[PDB]
Structures are given as structure tokens and as C-alpha cells.
Amino acid sequence: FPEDSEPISISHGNYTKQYPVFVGHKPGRTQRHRLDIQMIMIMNRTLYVAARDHIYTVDIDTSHTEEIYCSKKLTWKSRQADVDTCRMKGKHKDECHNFIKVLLKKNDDTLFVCGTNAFNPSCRNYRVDTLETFGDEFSGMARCPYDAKHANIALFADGKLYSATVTDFLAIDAVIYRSLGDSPTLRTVKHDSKWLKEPYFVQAVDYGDYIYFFFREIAVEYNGKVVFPRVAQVCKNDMGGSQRVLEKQWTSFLKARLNCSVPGDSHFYFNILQAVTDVIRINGRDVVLATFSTPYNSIPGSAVCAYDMLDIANVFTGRFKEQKSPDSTWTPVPDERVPKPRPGCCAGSSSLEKYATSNEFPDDTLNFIKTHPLMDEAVPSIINRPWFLRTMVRYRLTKIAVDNAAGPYQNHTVVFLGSEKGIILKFLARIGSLNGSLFLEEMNVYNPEKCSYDGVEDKRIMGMQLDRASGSLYVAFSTCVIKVPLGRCERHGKCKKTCIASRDPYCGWVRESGSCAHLSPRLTFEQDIERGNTDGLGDC
């Protein structure tokens, strides 16, 4: 098994503590209450911070102070009647508030916002410019969790809202769901373990004709109790089943195990999926990066694997899985036993042109996909081994941010990894004839002085947002958001050797000033990212 690589550089709290921090204050002048940040996102030039009872915004381009100030504040507190109801059902005072868990750009003028609303999930439209709501409230059931601690997915595609959460207060009825967009609402088959077995929802992406969902669940291929990572497709144009079969349910839902393994005399799999990026074009290919850990009761380890959207689409064209008899191993269904038209193919697809919508699909096709949602094959990662590995630390790798246009010629790919302990890992994607990774830097960004207050010291990174124009990576914790500089250039000061050795696409040696500097689009800008060559230099 692969040894842990060492980073070229390390940054401790001593240096990082000078990074600007947002803690929810407007500019007008010591009251401190934990923010309960849930997620962050950048739209246009505005950073949105979704939290308890609020969404704060920071205008990125005009924020230069050491304390990052809130620019506009959206306020949405639960009605007292809902708070009281929440408490009577036995929930605690801290959790019976409105935690914002869905925040989406519906269009240029409109935000779609959903909050737990004291275990009575609710959604609203908000004006982008005034952050005031307009129109009727929308039901939140199946669109937004009740409990802020739960993981959930929401995404718009073509006006339709795709969501994944639980429909019920008791958190028993986990669902992948679609609504809005003037199309029928669709859901996964309630209480059906072949469709979903205690899923934990991680990510969805919109690609080609499909929405793909990433998640983990108890694996039926193991009937003692093992969690597998999954990706699933649904057709964007799905209209539900016929009056006889899968009425009001998906007719295109299929899923496959994700393969993130280390090759050996018996493969070792990373099964506990932590995060997945949006689709990123890296080196001609369309790809997602995904972080995995070993089970929490196991010896701790983490990995990043990459997946080509092409390999993902391809797994759904292969054989389906089945149990020929109860309590037997799972085998591939022979294609001769697969109905026509093929389950999981979209109406109007090649050879399905006869079908106006999935409502016209034959019963054999529908009963089949209802009883065979799982594919035989697992999706292979690019390179068939993890791009990055950590095995000798106590923390797990979690969030991911990617810059596929780093450097003078915008042709390096830099990947940032967050962790449950506030450490960020920075690495360079090896490319070409994508060949793994180079560990550039490790850095502790958690700032106890600004982030540890109101009885909270929670170093779990909740989100990371990379922003090129401000040369920053925004790193969210529960109680704060930190503005992290993309490259620690001037660190190396006037030492040319450590500047060149860093192999950091964000940094170069500028002899006109005699110093290591960040890209300034001008003077000479020397770097050697491909090789680390410092022969004839030194030292420090």
C-alpha cells in the first residue's frame, strides 16, 4: 500500500490567523452568537452565506478589511407558532429555528430559498436585489430537510427542481424527488430497499440528457451491513409511468456502485463518499472529483478519485443485476431477458422515437426497471487508482474546490481539499500521457480567535468556494467564513530557490523586484511547475 507523500510546504495557524474572517457583522460598530452556517455559494460577484434564520451576503470585490462585513442581510425567522409546535413534538430549543438548507439561483432576478423552518420545511422566492420574498410560500416537504444536521440535494434544471432528502418528520422516507417546472412530480418508490437503502445524499449534477445523483447507501450486494458509494441517472424528460406501472414514479432511475480502489492482490475500496464536485472540463474531458473515506469504525483513511462523465453514462448501458433466488449472490441479467425498449433509456431516444413520453412505455419495460434499478458494473475511476491518498492522519478529507485555469497560461489544474479538522490540502493534477497528483501545500486555516466563541469549537469545513477574480478561496465553518489567498507567494520573500521549488502555478519569481510574487496580468515571471529545478540556486 502507497506511502503518504509529503507536501512541499506547510502553513500553520501562526501565518493563517491573519486571513480576513466573516462572522456576520454589518460595518456599523462585542455581542457574539454562533451563526450556524449551513452552506456558501457565489453568484455573480456576491458571496451568499446560508445560516440559521438568515442569508448574509458579502460583496466580494469591495471587501478589503480584516473583518469581512455583511453587505446585505436576508432575515427569515420561523413563526412563533411553528417554534412552539416544534418544541411540543419534543425537539430542542437550538434546533427549532429556520435553518436555510436550499439556496438556488432560479434566474437573474430570483432566488429560490428553503429552510427547515423548525421541523416544518418551507420554500420561498426571493428577489435578488432586495432580498425580500414575493408570492405565495411553497410547501417544503420532499424539497428540504426538517433537521439542519441532515445532508440534502437541490438543483434546478430546465425549470424543474430536483431534490433529495426525507419527506417525513421521523426521517424514515428518504426520497429522490422532482417538482415544479410545469411537469409532473416524480418520486422514488416509497419503502423500496432496492431503490434506496438508507441513503445519505451528497451531490447532483446536470449533464446531457440526465441528472446524476451521488450518494451512499447500505449495499444490497452484501446482504453483513456494508455502505457503498453510488451514482444514479434519471432522464430529464421523464414523465412518470403508465396508469398500470410506476404511475407518479421515476421510469428512468438506475444506479451503480462507484469504484474508488487501490489495485492489489485483492482490491481495497474507499466506500464512504464525502463530496463530489460539479462537472469540470479538465484536459478535454468532462469529469467530477469525489472524496471517499473508510468507515468511521475502521482505521481512518481518505482518497480522491476522478470520474469521466463518459464512463458514468456508459455503466448504464451494461447489464443489470439480479438475485436469481433469495439469499444468493448477485449476478448479471443476460441481455436476452431485458425488455424492449431498454429500461432507463429516454423517450425520443434512438429507437424510442415512437414514445411521446414515458407514460407510453410498455408494462414489461416498466416492471423490469422497477425490480432492477441496480446495474451489475461499477464505474471505473480515471487511472484506476486514487489521484490522492491520506492514510496516516486522524482527519477525513471532505470538501473539494477545483481551479482548472491556474497560472500565466491558464493551463494548470489546482485542487483544494477541505477536512473535518480545518486543514486544507492543495495539490496539482498531473496531466496527459491525467496521471495522478503532486502535493503542493497543507495549511491550517481555522482561526480559534475569530471562530471559537459562544461555546463552539467546530473545525468542520462546511463549504469552499474558489473565486478567481478575488484571488481567493472562501472556506466556511459553522461560526465563520475565512478568506484564504490562493497562493502564499511572498511567504518565500526574496529566496528564489523556495519560490521556484514550490511548483505553485499561482507564484513566480520576479527579478525586477527581486521577490516571489503572484501572477500580475507587466514584468518577467519565472516558474518551473513541470520540474522543480533549483540547481545553481540557494539557499535558505
Ligand X SMILES: *[C@@H]1O[C@H](CO)[C@@H](O[C@@H]2O[C@H](CO)[C@@H](O[C@@H]3O[C@H](CO[C@H]4O[C@H](CO)[C@@H](O)[C@H](O)[C@@H]4O)[C@@H](O)[C@H](O[C@H]4O[C@H](CO)[C@@H](O)[C@H](O)[C@@H]4O)[C@@H]3O)[C@H](O)[C@H]2NC(C)=O)[C@H](O)[C@H]1NC(C)=O
Ligand Y SMILES: *[C@@H]1O[C@H](CO)[C@@H](O[C@@H]2O[C@H](CO)[C@@H](O)[C@H](O)[C@H]2NC(C)=O)[C@H](O)[C@H]1NC(C)=O
Among 44, 62, 317, 351, binds ligand NAG (CB under 6 A): 44
Residues of span 87-146 touching ligand NAG by CB under 6 A: 108
Phi and psi at residue 266, in whole multiples of 5°?
135, 110
Instruction: Pick what 84 binds: ligand NAG, ligand Y, its own copies, none; C-beta below 5 to 8 Å, kind-dependent.
Output: none
Question: According to the binding rule CB under 6 A, does residue 284 interact with ligand NAG?
Answer: no
* Nine cell digits for residue 456: 463552539
CB of 360 to ligand Y, least distance (A): 32
Question: According to the binding rule CB under 6 A, does residue 380 interact with ligand Y?
Answer: yes
CB of 83 to ligand NAG, least distance (A): 35
Segment interacting with ligand Y, rule: CB under 6 A, options 62-70, 256-264, 365-373, 488-496 = 256-264
C-alpha–C-alpha distance, residues 142 and 455, integer Å? 33
A 10 A CB-CB count for 296 gives 9
Among 35, 47, 49, 378, binds ligand Y (CB under 6 A): 378
Quick one: which H or E segment has residue 106?
strand 100-107
Question: According to the binding rule CB under 6 A, does residue 45 interact with ligand NAG?
Answer: yes
CB of 260 to ligand NAG, least distance (A): 26
C-alpha–C-alpha distance, residues 177 and 168, integer Å? 13
Tallying the residues shown for the chain, one arrives at: 540
Instruction: Pick what 243 binds: ligand X, its own copies, ligand Y, none; C-beta below 5 to 8 Å, kind-dependent.
Output: none
Q: Is 410 left (phi over 0), alpha (psi -120 to 50) or beta?
A: left
Question: According to the binding rule CB under 6 A, does residue 413 interact with ligand Y?
Answer: no
C-alpha–C-alpha distance, residues 524 and 532, integer Å? 18
Among 31, 325, 329, 433, binds ligand X (CB under 6 A): 433
| Interface size with ligand X, residues (CB under 6 A) | 5
Instruction: Pick what 244 binds: its own copies, ligand Y, ligand NAG, none; C-beta below 5 to 8 Å, kind-dependent.
Output: none
CB of 328 to its own copies, least distance (A): 6
Residues forming beta bridges with residue 484, ordered by sequence position: 473
Question: According to the binding rule CB under 6 A, does residue 533 interact with ligand Y?
Answer: no
Give the list of residues 6+ apart from residue 512 with CB closer than 8 angstroms, or none.
Answer: 523, 524
Residues of span 412-431 touching ligand X by CB under 6 A: 430
Q: Specify burial of residue 438 (Cβ count, 10 A radius: 0-12, 13-18, 19+).
A: middle
Instruction: Pick what 28 binds: ligand Y, its own copies, ligand NAG, none; C-beta below 5 to 8 Å, kind-dependent.
Output: none
> Max CA-CA distance within the chain?
78
Residues forming beta bridges with residue 134, ordered by sequence position: 125
Is the separation of the CB atoms in 261 and 385 below 8 Å?
yes
Binding mask 102-121 for ligand Y (x = CB under 6 A): -------x------------
Quick one: which H or E segment has residue 227?
strand 227-235
Alpha-helical (H) ranges within 148-276 are none
Alpha-helical (H) ranges within 358-427 are 363-371
CB of 264 to its own copies, least distance (A): 3
Question: According to the binding rule CB under 6 A, does residue 263 interact with ligand Y?
Answer: yes
Interface ranges with its own copies (CB under 8 A): 1, 3, 224-227, 262-268, 294-301, 327-329, 391-392, 394
Count of CA atoms in the C-beta half-sphere (13 A) of 260: 30
Instruction: Pick what 108 binds: ligand NAG, its own copies, ligand Y, none; C-beta below 5 to 8 Å, kind-dependent.
Output: ligand NAG
CB of 44 to ligand NAG, least distance (A): 4
DSSP string over 478-499 = SS-EEEEES---GGGTT-HHHH
Question: According to the binding rule CB under 6 A, does residue 127 interact with ligand Y?
Answer: no
Among 435, 454, 511, 540, binds ligand X (CB under 6 A): 435
**CA 225, 195, 315, 377 torsion-angle sign:** positive
CB of 308 to ligand X, least distance (A): 16
Question: According to the binding rule CB under 6 A, does residue 259 interact with ligand Y?
Answer: yes
Is the separation of the CB atoms in 425 and 401 below 8 Å?
no
Contact residues for ligand NAG (CB under 6 A)?
A: 44-45, 108, 409, 411
Contact residues for ligand Y (CB under 6 A)?
A: 44, 109, 259, 261, 263, 267, 378, 380, 384, 409, 411-412, 431
